[PDB]
């Protein structure tokens, strides 16, 4: 099943391809091969986000 994380902090994209989100958002983790920047999806957008802004759900 898909892995989900939940946002601990609001994140405003600064570069192309980054995924924005607000606290409480559930993000589907699509790629966690890098220890710092993961690829995720939320509400129909996908993009890279900082792992230190989220916490594990499942």
């Amino acid at each position: 099943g898909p892995t989900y994380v939940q946002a601990l902090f609001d994140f405003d994209p600064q570069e192309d391809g980054e995924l924005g989100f607000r606290r409480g958002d559930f993000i589907h983790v699509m790629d966690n091969s890098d220890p710092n920047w993961w690829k995720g999806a939320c509400h129909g957008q996908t993009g890279m986000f900082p792992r230190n802004y989220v916490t594990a759900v499942n």
């Binding site: 902090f9 609001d10 994140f11 600064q14 710092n36 920047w37 900082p50 792992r51 230190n52 802004y53």
Partner: peptide
């Protein structure tokens, strides 16, 4: 303040 953006690889 929110945490610093980590290094891009």
């Amino acid at each position: 303040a929110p945490p610093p953006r980590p290094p891009k690889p």
